[PDB]
Coordinates of C-alpha atoms and ligand atoms in Angstrom, one line a residue:
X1 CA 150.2 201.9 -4.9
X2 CA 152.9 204.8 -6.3
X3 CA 151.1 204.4 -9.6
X4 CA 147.4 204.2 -8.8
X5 CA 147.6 207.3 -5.6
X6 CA 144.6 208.2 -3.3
X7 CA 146.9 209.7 -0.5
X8 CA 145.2 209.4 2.5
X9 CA 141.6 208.4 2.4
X10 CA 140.3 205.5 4.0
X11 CA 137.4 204.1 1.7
X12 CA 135.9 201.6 4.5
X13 CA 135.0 204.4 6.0
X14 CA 133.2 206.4 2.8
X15 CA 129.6 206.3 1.9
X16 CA 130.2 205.1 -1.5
X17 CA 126.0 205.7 -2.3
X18 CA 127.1 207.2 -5.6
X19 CA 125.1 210.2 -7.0
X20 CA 125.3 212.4 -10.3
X21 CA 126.0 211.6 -14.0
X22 CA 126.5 207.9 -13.9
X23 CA 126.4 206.3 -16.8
X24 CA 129.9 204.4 -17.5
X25 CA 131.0 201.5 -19.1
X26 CA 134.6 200.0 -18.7
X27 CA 135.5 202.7 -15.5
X28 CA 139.0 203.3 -14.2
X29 CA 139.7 206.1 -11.7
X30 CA 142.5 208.3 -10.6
X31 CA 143.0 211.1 -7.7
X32 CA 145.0 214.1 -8.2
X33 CA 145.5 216.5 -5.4
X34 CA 141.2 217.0 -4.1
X35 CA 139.6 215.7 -7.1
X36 CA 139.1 212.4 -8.1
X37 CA 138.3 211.7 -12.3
X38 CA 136.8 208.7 -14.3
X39 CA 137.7 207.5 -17.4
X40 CA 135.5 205.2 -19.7
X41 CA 134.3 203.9 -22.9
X42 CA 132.8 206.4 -25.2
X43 CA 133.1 209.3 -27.7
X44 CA 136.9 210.4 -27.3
X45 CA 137.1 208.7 -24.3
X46 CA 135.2 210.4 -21.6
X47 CA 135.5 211.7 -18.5
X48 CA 134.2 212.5 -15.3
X49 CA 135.0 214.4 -12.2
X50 CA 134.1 214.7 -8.4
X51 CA 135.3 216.6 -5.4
X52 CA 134.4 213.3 -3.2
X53 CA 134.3 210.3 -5.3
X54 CA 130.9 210.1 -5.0
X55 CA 129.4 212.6 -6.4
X56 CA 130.3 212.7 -10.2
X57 CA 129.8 215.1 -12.8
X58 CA 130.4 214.8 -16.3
X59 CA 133.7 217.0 -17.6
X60 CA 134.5 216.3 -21.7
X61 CA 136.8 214.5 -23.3
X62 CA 140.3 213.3 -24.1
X63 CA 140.4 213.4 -28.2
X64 CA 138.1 216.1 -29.7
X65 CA 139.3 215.0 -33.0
X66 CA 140.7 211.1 -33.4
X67 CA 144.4 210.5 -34.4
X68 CA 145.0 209.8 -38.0
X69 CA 147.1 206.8 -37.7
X70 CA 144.0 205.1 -36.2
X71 CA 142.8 204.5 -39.5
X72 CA 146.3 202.2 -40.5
X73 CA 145.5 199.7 -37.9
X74 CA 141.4 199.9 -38.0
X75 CA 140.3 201.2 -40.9
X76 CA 136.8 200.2 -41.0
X77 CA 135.9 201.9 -37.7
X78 CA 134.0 204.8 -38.5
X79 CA 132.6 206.8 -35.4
X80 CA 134.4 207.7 -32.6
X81 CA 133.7 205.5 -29.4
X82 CA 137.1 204.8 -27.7
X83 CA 136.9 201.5 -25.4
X84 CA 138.5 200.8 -21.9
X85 CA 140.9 203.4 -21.0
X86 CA 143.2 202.7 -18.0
X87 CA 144.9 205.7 -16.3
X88 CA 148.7 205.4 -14.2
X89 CA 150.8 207.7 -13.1
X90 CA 154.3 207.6 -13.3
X91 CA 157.3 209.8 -13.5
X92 CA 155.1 212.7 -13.1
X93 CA 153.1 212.0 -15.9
X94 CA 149.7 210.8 -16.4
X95 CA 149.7 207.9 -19.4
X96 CA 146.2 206.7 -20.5
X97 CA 146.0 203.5 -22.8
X98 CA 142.8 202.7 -24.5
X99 CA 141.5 200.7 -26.8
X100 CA 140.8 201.6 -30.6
X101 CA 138.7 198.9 -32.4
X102 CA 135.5 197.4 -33.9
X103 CA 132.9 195.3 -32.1
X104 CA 132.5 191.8 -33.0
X105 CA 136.5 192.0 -34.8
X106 CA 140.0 191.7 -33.7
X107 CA 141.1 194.2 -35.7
X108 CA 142.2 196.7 -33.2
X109 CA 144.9 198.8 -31.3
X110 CA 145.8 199.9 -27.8
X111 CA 146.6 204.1 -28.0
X112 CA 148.4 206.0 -25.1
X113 CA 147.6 209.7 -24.5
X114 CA 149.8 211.4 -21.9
X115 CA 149.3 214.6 -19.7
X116 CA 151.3 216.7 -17.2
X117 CA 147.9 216.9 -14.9
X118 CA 144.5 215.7 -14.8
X119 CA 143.3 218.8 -13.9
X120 CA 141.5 221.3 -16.8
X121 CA 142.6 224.4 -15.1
X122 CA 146.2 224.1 -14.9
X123 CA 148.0 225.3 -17.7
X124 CA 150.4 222.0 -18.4
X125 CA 147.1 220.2 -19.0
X126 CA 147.4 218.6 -22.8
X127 CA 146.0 215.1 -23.7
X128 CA 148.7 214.4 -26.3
X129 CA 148.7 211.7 -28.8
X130 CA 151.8 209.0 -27.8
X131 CA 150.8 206.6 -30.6
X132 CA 149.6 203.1 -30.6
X133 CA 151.3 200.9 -27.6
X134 CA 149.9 196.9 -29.1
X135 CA 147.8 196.0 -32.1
X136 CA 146.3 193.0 -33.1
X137 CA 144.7 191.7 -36.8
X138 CA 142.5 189.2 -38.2
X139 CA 145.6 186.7 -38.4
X140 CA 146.6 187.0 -34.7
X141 CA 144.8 185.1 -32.2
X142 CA 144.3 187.7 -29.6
X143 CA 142.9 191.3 -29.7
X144 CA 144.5 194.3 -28.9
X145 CA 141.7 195.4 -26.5
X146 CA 141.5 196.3 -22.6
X147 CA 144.4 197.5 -21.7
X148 CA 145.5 197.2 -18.2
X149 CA 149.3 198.6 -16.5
X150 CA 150.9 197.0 -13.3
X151 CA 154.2 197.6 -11.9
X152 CA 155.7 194.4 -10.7
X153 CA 157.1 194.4 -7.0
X154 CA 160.4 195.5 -8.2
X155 CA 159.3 198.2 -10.8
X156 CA 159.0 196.6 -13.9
X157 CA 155.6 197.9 -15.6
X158 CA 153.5 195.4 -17.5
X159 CA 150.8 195.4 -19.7
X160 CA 147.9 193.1 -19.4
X161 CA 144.8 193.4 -22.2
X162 CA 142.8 190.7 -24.2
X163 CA 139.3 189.7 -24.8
X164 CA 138.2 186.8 -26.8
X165 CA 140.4 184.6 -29.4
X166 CA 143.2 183.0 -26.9
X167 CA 142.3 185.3 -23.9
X168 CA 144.5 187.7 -21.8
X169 CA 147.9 188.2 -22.9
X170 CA 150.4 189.9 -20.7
X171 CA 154.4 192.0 -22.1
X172 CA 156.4 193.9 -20.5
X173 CA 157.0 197.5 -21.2
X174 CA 160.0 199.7 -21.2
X175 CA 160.0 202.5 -17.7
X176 CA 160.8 205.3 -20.4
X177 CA 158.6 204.6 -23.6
X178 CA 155.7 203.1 -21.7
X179 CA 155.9 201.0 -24.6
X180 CA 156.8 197.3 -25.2
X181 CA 159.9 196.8 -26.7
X182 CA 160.0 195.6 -30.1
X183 CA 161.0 192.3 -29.3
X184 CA 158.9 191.4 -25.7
X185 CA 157.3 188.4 -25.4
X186 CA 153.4 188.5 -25.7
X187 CA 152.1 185.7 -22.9
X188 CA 148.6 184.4 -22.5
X189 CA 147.4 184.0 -19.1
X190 CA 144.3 183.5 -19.1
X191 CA 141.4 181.5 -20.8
X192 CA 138.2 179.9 -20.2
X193 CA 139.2 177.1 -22.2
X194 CA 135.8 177.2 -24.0
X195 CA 134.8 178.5 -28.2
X196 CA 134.1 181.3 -27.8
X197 CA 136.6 182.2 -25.3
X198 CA 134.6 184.7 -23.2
X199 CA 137.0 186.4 -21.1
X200 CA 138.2 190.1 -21.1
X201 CA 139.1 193.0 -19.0
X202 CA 142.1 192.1 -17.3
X203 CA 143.2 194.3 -14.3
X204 CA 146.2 193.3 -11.8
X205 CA 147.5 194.1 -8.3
X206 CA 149.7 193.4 -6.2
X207 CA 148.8 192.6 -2.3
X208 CA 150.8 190.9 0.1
X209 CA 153.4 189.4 -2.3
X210 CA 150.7 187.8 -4.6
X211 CA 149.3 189.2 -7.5
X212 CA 145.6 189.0 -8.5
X213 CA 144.3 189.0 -11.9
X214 CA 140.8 190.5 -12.4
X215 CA 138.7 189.4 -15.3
X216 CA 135.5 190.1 -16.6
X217 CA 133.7 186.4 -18.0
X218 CA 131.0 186.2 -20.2
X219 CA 129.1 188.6 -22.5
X220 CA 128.8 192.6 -22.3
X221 CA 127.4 195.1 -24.0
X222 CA 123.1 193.7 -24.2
X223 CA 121.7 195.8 -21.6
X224 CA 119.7 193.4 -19.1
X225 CA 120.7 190.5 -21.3
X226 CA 124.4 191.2 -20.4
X227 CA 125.7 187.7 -18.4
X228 CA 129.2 189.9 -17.5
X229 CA 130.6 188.5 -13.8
X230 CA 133.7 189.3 -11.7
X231 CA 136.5 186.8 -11.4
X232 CA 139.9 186.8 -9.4
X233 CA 142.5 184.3 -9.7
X234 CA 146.1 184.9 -8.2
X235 CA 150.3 184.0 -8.3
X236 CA 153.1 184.6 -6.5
X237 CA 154.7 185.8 -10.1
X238 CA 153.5 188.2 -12.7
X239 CA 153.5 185.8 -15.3
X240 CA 151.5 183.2 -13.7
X241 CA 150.2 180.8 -13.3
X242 CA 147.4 182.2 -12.1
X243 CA 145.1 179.9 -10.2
X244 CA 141.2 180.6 -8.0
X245 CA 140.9 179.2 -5.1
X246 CA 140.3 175.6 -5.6
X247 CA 143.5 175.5 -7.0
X248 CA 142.5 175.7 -10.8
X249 CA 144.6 177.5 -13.4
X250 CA 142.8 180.7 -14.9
X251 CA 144.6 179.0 -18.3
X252 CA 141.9 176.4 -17.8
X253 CA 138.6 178.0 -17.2
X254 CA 139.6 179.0 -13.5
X255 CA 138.5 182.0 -11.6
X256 CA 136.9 182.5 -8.0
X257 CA 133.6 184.8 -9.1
X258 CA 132.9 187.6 -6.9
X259 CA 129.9 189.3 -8.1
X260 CA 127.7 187.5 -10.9
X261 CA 124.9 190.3 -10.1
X262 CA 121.1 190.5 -9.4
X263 CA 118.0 191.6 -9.9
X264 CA 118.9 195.2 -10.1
X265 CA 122.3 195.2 -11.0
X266 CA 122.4 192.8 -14.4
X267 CA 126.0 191.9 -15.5
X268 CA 128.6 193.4 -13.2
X269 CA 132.2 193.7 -15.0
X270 CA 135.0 195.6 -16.2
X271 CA 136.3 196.5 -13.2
X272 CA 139.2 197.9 -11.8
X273 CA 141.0 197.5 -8.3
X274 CA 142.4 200.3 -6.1
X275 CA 144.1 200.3 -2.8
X276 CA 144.6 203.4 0.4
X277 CA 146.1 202.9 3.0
X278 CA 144.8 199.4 4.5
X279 CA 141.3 200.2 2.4
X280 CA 140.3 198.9 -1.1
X281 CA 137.5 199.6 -3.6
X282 CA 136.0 197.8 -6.4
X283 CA 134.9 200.0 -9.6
X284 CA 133.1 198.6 -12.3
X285 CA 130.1 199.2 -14.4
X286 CA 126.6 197.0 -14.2
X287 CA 123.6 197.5 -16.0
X288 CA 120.2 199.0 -14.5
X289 CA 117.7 197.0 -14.6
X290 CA 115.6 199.6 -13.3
X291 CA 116.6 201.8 -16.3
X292 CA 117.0 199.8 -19.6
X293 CA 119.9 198.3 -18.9
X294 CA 122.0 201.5 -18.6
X295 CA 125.5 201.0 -17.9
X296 CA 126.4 202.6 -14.7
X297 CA 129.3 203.5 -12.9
X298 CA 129.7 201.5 -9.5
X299 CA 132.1 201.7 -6.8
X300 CA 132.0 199.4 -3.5
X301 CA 134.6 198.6 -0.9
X302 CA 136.8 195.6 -1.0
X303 CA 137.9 193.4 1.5
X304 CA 140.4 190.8 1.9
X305 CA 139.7 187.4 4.2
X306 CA 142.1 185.7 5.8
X307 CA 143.6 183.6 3.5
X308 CA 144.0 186.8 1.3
X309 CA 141.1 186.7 -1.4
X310 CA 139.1 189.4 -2.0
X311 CA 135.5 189.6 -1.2
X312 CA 132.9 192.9 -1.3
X313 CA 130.7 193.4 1.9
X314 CA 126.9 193.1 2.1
Ligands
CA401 CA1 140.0 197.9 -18.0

């Protein structure tokens, strides 16, 4: 995927037995020449590193000091915690959305920081502030949360997000601003049909001329009382409609789940899908049961059956 690059590697082959500094919550990941780099939730977003992709070690932060103009679109929020971050690469340049808001309010708006690199040591590297992307308030009936980027078959980038209120939304953005235009339609795409409308997280590929949306259902965020769960539907277009596997639109309630958790692992979700060569991996966060219902980063190979859907191996 030009925009999500791991070069080589073939990850059905890795021992994906992560080790290090593993709390995360909301996990995206990119590779940049040897060493690979998460992104999640947290104080100015934060970020982790690894020579492997397996063993990770925590390395800062993207905002030391938050952006004024957060404050004209949110401005209740008062600490620092950044949610969701998804990193693409494009055009030589490294654009990060993420997710400025307030729990339990749809008050809120998607950022984009951009860099040259990824990597600390190399002079070009600058997190700089590109402004806010899509923003929702108490009168709209989505929320400006989770943002997601996919580039369409032919090129077109798009911008998937949503949690709550209506669901996922979906608009277009322009190849040079990385921004919507001003006048791009905003579609919803998904919904569980139910009040409230727990759905979030939205991540989309493209495999084999379909693509599949990614959602997280259910609740977050309550340690081992988290109910979070992975569901895919999929479309031969972008803009839907997106339908599981017993033919139900994800407008409806439908998704195929593919990991609800366990015992250990409570709550699986927020994930994030990438592709090497004919390999895949899952990344997402669950929470430890083991450890107070930590959030914690996990990363697990993903397959595809026959008929195409996805599926992780036991
Ligand atoms: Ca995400």
């Amino acid at each position: 995927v030009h925009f999500h690059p791991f070069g080589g590697v073939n990850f059905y082959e890795m021992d994906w037995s992560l080790k290090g500094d593993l709390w995360a919550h909301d996990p995206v990941i990119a590779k940049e020449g040897s060493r690979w780099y998460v992104f999640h939730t947290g104080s100015g977003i934060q970020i982790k590193t690894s020579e492997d992709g397996v063993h990770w070690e925590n390395m800062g932060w993207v905002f030391p000091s938050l952006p004024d103009w957060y404050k004209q679109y949110v401005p209740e929020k008062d600490e620092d915690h950044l949610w969701a971050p998804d990193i693409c690469f494009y055009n030589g340049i490294y654009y990060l959305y993420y997710s400025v808001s307030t729990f339990g309010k749809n008050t809120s708006v998607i950022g984009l920081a951009t860099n040259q690199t990824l990597d600390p040591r190399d002079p070009d590297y600058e997190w700089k502030d590109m402004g806010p992307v899509i923003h929702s308030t108490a009168s709209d009936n989505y929320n400006a949360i989770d943002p997601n980027v996919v580039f369409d078959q032919e090129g077109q980038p798009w911008l998937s997000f949503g949690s709550f209120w209506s669901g996922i939304q979906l608009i277009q953005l322009d190849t040079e601003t990385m921004k919507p235009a001003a006048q791009a339609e905003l579609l919803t795409i998904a919904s569980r049909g139910e009040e409230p409308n727990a759905i979030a997280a939205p991540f989309i590929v493209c495999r084999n001329g379909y693509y599949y949306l990614f959602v997280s259902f259910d609740f977050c965020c309550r340690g081992i009382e988290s109910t979070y769960k992975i569901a895919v539907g999929r479309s031969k277009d972008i803009t839907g409609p997106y339908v599981d596997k017993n033919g139900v639109s994800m407008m409806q309630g439908g998704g195929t789940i593919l990991d609800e958790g366990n015992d250990r692992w409570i709550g699986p979700g927020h994930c994030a899908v990438y592709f090497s060569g004919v390999s895949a991996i899952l990344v997402n966060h669950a929470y430890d049961a083991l450890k107070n219902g930590e959030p914690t980063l996990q990363i697990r190979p993903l397959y595809w059956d026959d008929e195409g859907w996805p599926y992780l191996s036991v």
